[PDB]
Design an enzyme around this catalytic site. Structure first.
Site, PDB file in Angstrom:
ATOM      1  CB  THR A 159      -1.050  -0.065   1.030  1.00  0.00           C
ATOM      2  OG1 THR A 159      -1.938  -1.227   0.939  1.00  0.00           O
ATOM      3  CG2 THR A 159      -1.854   1.257   1.030  1.00  0.00           C
ATOM      4  CG  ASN A 180       3.288  -1.521   3.801  1.00  0.00           C
ATOM      5  OD1 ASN A 180       2.957  -0.348   3.311  1.00  0.00           O
ATOM      6  ND2 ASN A 180       2.348  -2.347   3.350  1.00  0.00           N
ATOM      7  CG  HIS A 265      -5.018  -8.084   4.284  1.00  0.00           C
ATOM      8  ND1 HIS A 265      -3.749  -8.508   3.999  1.00  0.00           N
ATOM      9  CD2 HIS A 265      -5.055  -6.891   3.940  1.00  0.00           C
ATOM     10  CE1 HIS A 265      -3.084  -7.777   3.615  1.00  0.00           C
ATOM     11  NE2 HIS A 265      -3.812  -6.622   3.287  1.00  0.00           N
ATOM     12  CG  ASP A 308      -3.293   0.324  -2.912  1.00  0.00           C
ATOM     13  OD1 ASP A 308      -4.221  -0.489  -3.198  1.00  0.00           O
ATOM     14  OD2 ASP A 308      -3.130   0.338  -1.733  1.00  0.00           O
ATOM     15  CG  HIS A 309      -1.551  -3.350  -3.485  1.00  0.00           C
ATOM     16  ND1 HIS A 309      -2.617  -4.146  -2.858  1.00  0.00           N
ATOM     17  CD2 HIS A 309      -1.389  -2.479  -2.718  1.00  0.00           C
ATOM     18  CE1 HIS A 309      -2.845  -3.293  -1.554  1.00  0.00           C
ATOM     19  NE2 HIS A 309      -2.026  -2.390  -1.272  1.00  0.00           N
ATOM     20  CG  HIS A 420      -1.065  -6.638  -0.876  1.00  0.00           C
ATOM     21  ND1 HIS A 420      -0.198  -5.676  -0.585  1.00  0.00           N
ATOM     22  CD2 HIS A 420      -1.844  -6.573   0.070  1.00  0.00           C
ATOM     23  CE1 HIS A 420      -0.835  -4.838   0.323  1.00  0.00           C
ATOM     24  NE2 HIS A 420      -1.712  -5.641   0.774  1.00  0.00           N
ATOM     25  CG  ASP A 683      23.345   0.249 -13.137  1.00  0.00           C
ATOM     26  OD1 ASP A 683      23.862   1.293 -12.883  1.00  0.00           O
ATOM     27  OD2 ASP A 683      22.198  -0.005 -12.567  1.00  0.00           O
ATOM     28  CG  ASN A 685      26.272   3.330  -9.778  1.00  0.00           C
ATOM     29  OD1 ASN A 685      25.629   3.019 -10.791  1.00  0.00           O
ATOM     30  ND2 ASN A 685      26.991   4.597  -9.884  1.00  0.00           N
ATOM     31  CG  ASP A 687      23.163   4.694 -10.886  1.00  0.00           C
ATOM     32  OD1 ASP A 687      23.043   3.866 -11.999  1.00  0.00           O
ATOM     33  OD2 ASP A 687      23.712   5.633 -11.030  1.00  0.00           O
TER      34      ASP A 687
END
Ligand SMILES: *[C@@H]1O[C@H](CO)[C@@H](O[C@@H]2O[C@H](CO)[C@@H](O[C@@H]3O[C@H](CO[C@H]4O[C@H](CO)[C@@H](O)[C@H](O[C@H]5O[C@H](CO)[C@@H](O)[C@H](O)[C@@H]5O[C@H]5O[C@H](CO)[C@@H](O)[C@H](O)[C@@H]5O)[C@@H]4O)[C@@H](O)[C@H](O[C@H]4O[C@H](CO)[C@@H](O)[C@H](O)[C@@H]4O[C@H]4O[C@H](CO)[C@@H](O)[C@H](O)[C@@H]4O)[C@@H]3O)[C@H](O)[C@H]2NC(C)=O)[C@H](O)[C@H]1NC(C)=O
Ligand SMILES: Cc1nnn(Cc2cc(C(F)(F)F)ccc2CCC(=O)N2CCC(S(=O)(=O)c3ccc(S(N)(=O)=O)cc3F)CC2)n1
Ligand SMILES: [Ca+2]
Ligand SMILES: [K+]
Ligand code: NA
Ligand SMILES: [Zn+2]
Length: 805
Positions: A159, A180, A265, A308-309, A420, A683, A685, A687
């Site tokens: 979330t 989270n 949930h 959001d998901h 999730h 790559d 590093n 990033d």
């Protein structure tokens, strides 16, 4: 301290949050235990429920009432959402046949169409189909508006990271909210769902939409709501703010629902109990639409319905335990659940060694339901490494499964039936998007797209300039009626040299042997033009890639392929070639097995050498244009040029060969020709951005030949597969990958078997968007097509996921 003896009279859901110790009346006051004594009485009114009834029509305004049925209410803005239906003979928004909204139909005084963002936690994408009989208002929005079949969240599919990505257009590595749950080693601070540390602003990077608006003279309603404010009140407040005077009224608003996440949930995504929460959310959508209709704003305001998901079936019995893999289990901290993050429990403990721990977690059980990774080796599409709050060790968990530290954690904290957080390409994690209003298209379906793209579109809808972000601005122009952002192509920084024959065989001292001394004016001119680019139009279908940094490179033409060769990195940055449907695979002949030929257009000192490969016991080499697919035996020599050579661990060579010898031809059969552009990536590093010369951590033993961290390929063809790739009139079709260049194959548990039982699976795991590859290489592809630039951007952001429908 809160001196909670101020009042809330005339301050209900104030937009400017006041400073401690004055008591607050904002929509977040509860959360911080800071409301004025009188907040419930004056702001959380509930008397008489939420609906007008016949008896209430024309009543006397009584301020204790939740919402009003008195005659005066509409101007004041505080009617019950059903007032005109009940009292004035009108119909519910949902019962009206929908009508195109060609222009914003707003009251005077409105300077732009406002935006309302209606966000819903855990709204799985399949709910639009599977719950359509019970969700009629959302069904109206979707079919009359613009909608995608699904929207891809960011990893991890939790979330907080996702809502803040929607708000910023940033990947979680860039915005800071990587979970989270989070430990920041610089602050020595933890961040949790429960508690107070999540309110400190030092966690929250980027620039979210509400600040972007404020900073640019566009007023925002506050996005956050305390969990105890009921949904009907949140709606009434938004309709209240919309009724405000022109110089106070916000232009952007957010609603948030905790459902269906909260229930899924408990009961799982498709639990029989889940029908009711979907009924309630729809009714909440209906109230809003009826409210807007009453204020004559229903054809003025742009509404976004986004999640959001999604949500997956997960239970306690499907839990893997680190205690069954590690002897040392009390020296590690684990962030558990649908992903795994491991750090040392105590940093004083010097025996802690992540390498040993990964080893103990690597293909130990036959059906292991997680896989361990150094974060830099995670699929580059997850963009989950460049932040100090992400632990060096990560566990990607299988959909449907949990990882915990010890059994006691699962039965001393079965309750949950859904969870999730898994990989963002998993179908059950996909979520929704609908746009509806005057600025969105009518009755339009759009393809699936990523939520990192929304920040830009919400700026376009409000006429704001976006803060820098991970969206590709203009990739979603096809959602909009107008306000489209019209980008220009980045300007090429370095222009290519085109070298001819300047060097003699004998100048090259490479240790490279080749049995090629095998000698006419038909064929001598024929192949010079090949070396001048007579078949470039065959192999460079969409223009050459522009190099958008300062460097030194050469374009090399050959019969079967074309490349941009780097004098700094001693290998190609890109290599382009076309294989048609009718093409043939042949072996490498024996006279050439360990043959490498000097390229007479490129100095010895800007070339690789075989002696370094000889001396490096760990490293070997391969080729970017596969010798296997040359057009003719004269042409096959070109594939053995030193300038087509790249460094490859033997382990990765099994992968590369399989792709080069089997898969490319398959794709050419399945897709009716393919264009292929392949190169190295550096790559070091992690990033997700192109390394400079001086960030390279590894060279081939005793040379300046730098070692790629990854290898990419972009495979392009016609969307209408009846037309072959080289002759395509319409839209294009693409799939790309970024394979990690690794010294072993510990990542693939079946790797002792034949390559047909594991390589194609590895590639799927490391599917990529062309735009990922652009960031990592500093190149811009598809420069010269017949297509519009916004259609090319959409193509560039596409990800082939290999999930079924
Ligand atoms: C996704 O999109 C984003 C958005 O654009 C892309 O991220 C950007 O990448 C840029 C290039 O890597 C980076 O630009 C740097 O800015 C540095 C100053 O940054 C501060 O100010 C900005 C602007 O207001 C702010 O946004 C930043 O916020 C970051 O840091 C805070 C921490 O307090 C976080 O809250 C926030 O979430 C964000 O963190 C993220 O970014 C940083 C990188 O900046 C990461 O370290 C984090 O892990 C996290 O991901 C900052 O508050 C500036 O210092 C950089 O300049 C250095 O390098 C240049 C080389 O040209 C040199 O000229 C400078 O002198 C400087 O070097 C000097 O300092 C070094 C350290 O002391 C030292 O090594 C040198 O020797 C020198 O002394 C650089 O210009 C930009 O900040 C981020 N933005 C964000 C929001 O992340 C991202 O790339 C995109 N991803 C993909 C795949 O495309
Ligand atoms: C997380 C997160 N990131 N962005 N949002 C806002 C949001 C965005 C978008 C959308 F879709 F447009 F982006 C749509 C909707 C929202 C609202 C989300 C919401 O109401 N809640 C409930 C309260 C929790 S909280 O209590 O934990 C909390 C976290 C942070 C802050 S702070 N320091 O940034 O002020 C204060 C705070 F109270 C956050 C989730 N939530
Ligand atoms: Ca880099
Ligand atoms: K070797
Ligand atoms: Na293996
Ligand atoms: Zn949840």
């Amino acid at each position: 301290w809160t001196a909670t003896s101020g009042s809330c009279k005339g301050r209900c859901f104030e937009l400017q949050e006041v400073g401690p110790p004055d008591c607050r009346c904002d929509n977040l006051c509860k959360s911080y235990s800071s409301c004025c004594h009188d907040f419930d009485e004056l702001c959380l009114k509930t008397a008489r429920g939420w609906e007008c009834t016949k008896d209430r029509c024309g009543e006397v305004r009584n301020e204790e009432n939740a919402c009003h049925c008195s005659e005066d209410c509409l101007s004041r803005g505080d009617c019950c959402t059903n007032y005109q239906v009940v009292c004035k003979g009108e119909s519910h928004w949902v019962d009206d046949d929908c009508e195109e909204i060609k222009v914003p139909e707003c009251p005077a005084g409105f300077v732009r169409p406002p935006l309302i963002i209606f966000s819903v936690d855990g709204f799985r994408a399949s709910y639009m189909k599977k719950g359509s009989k019970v969700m009629p208002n959302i069904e109206k929005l979707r079919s009359c508006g613009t909608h995608a079949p699904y929207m891809r969240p960011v990893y991890p599919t939790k979330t907080f990271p996702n809502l803040y990505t929607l708000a910023t257009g940033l990947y979680p590595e860039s915005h800071g909210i990587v979970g989270n749950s989070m430990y920041d080693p610089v602050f020595d601070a933890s961040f949790h769902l429960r508690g107070r540390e999540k309110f400190n602003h030092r966690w929250w990077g980027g620039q979210p939409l509400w600040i972007t608006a404020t900073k640019q003279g566009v007023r925002a309603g506050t996005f956050f709501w305390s969990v105890s404010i009921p949904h009907e009140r949140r709606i009434l407040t938004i309709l209240q703010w919309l009724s405000l005077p022109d110089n106070e009224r916000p232009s952007v608003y957010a609603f948030y629902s905790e459902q269906p996440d909260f229930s899924g949930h408990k009961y799982g995504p498709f639990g029989p109990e889940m029908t009711n929460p979907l009924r309630e959310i729809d009714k909440t959508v209906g109230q809003l639409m009826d409210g807007l209709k009453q204020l004559r704003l229903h054809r003025c305001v742009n509404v976004i319905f986004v999640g959001d998901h999604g949500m997956e079936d997960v239970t306690c019995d499907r839990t893997e335990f680190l205690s069954n893999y590690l002897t040392n289990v009390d020296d590690i901290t684990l962030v558990p659940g649908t992903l795994g993050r491991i750090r040392a429990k105590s940093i004083n403990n010097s025996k802690y060694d992540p390498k040993t721990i990964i080893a103990a977690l690597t293909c130990k059980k036959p059906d292991q339901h997680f896989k361990p990774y150094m974060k830099q080796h995670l699929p580059k599409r997850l963009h989950y490494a460049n932040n100090r709050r992400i632990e060096d060790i990560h566990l990607l968990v299988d959909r449907r499964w949990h990882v915990a530290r010890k059994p006691l954690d699962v039965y001393k904290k079965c309750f949950f039936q859904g969870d999730h957080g898994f990989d963002n390409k998993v179908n059950s994690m996909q979520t929704v998007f609908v746009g509806y209003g005057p600025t969105f298209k009518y009755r339009t379906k759009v393809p699936p797209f990523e939520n990192i793209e929304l920040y830009n579109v919400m700026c376009d809808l409000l006429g704001l300039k976006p803060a820098p972000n991970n969206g590709t601005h203009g990739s979603l122009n096809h959602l909009l009626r107008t306000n489209t952002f019209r980008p220009t192509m980045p300007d090429e920084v370095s222009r290519p040299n085109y070298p001819g024959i300047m060097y003699l065989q004998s100048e090259f001292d490479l240790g490279c042997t080749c049995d090629d001394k095998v000698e006419n004016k038909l064929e001598e001119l024929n192949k010079r033009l090949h070396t001048k680019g007579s078949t470039k139009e065959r192999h460079l279908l969409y223009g050459r890639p522009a190099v958008l940094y300062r460097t030194s490179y050469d374009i090399l033409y050959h019969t079967d392929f074309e490349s941009g060769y780097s004098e700094i990195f001693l290998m190609p940055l890109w290599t382009s070639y076309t294989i048609s449907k009718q093409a043939e695979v042949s072996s490498i002949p024996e006279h050439l097995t360990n043959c490498v030929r000097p390229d007479v257009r490129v100095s010895p000192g800007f070339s690789q050498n075989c002696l370094a490969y000889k001396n490096d016991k760990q490293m070997s080499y391969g080729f970017l244009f596969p010798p296997y697919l040359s057009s003719s035996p004269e042409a096959k020599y070109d594939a053995f040029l030193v300038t087509n050579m790249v460094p490859m661990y033997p382990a990765f060579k099994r992968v590369w060969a399989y792709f080069q010898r089997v898969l490319v031809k398959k794709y050419a059969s399945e897709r009716n020709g393919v264009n292929v552009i392949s190169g190295p990536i550096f790559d070091y590093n992690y990033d997700g951005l192109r390394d400079t010369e001086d960030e390279i951590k590894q060279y081939v033993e005793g040379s300046s030949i730098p070692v790629p961290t990854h290898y990419y390929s972009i495979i392009t063809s016609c969307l209408d597969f009846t037309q072959p790739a080289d002759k395509c009139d319409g839209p294009l079709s693409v799939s790309s990958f970024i394979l990690p260049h690794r010294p072993d194959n510990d990542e693939s548990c079946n790797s002792s078997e034949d390559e047909s039982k594991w390589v194609e699976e590895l590639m799927k795991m490391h599917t990529a968007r062309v735009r990922d590859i652009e960031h990592l290489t500093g190149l811009d592809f598809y420069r010269k097509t017949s297509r519009s630039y916004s259609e090319i951007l959409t193509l560039k952001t596409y990800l082939h996921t290999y999930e079924s429908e």
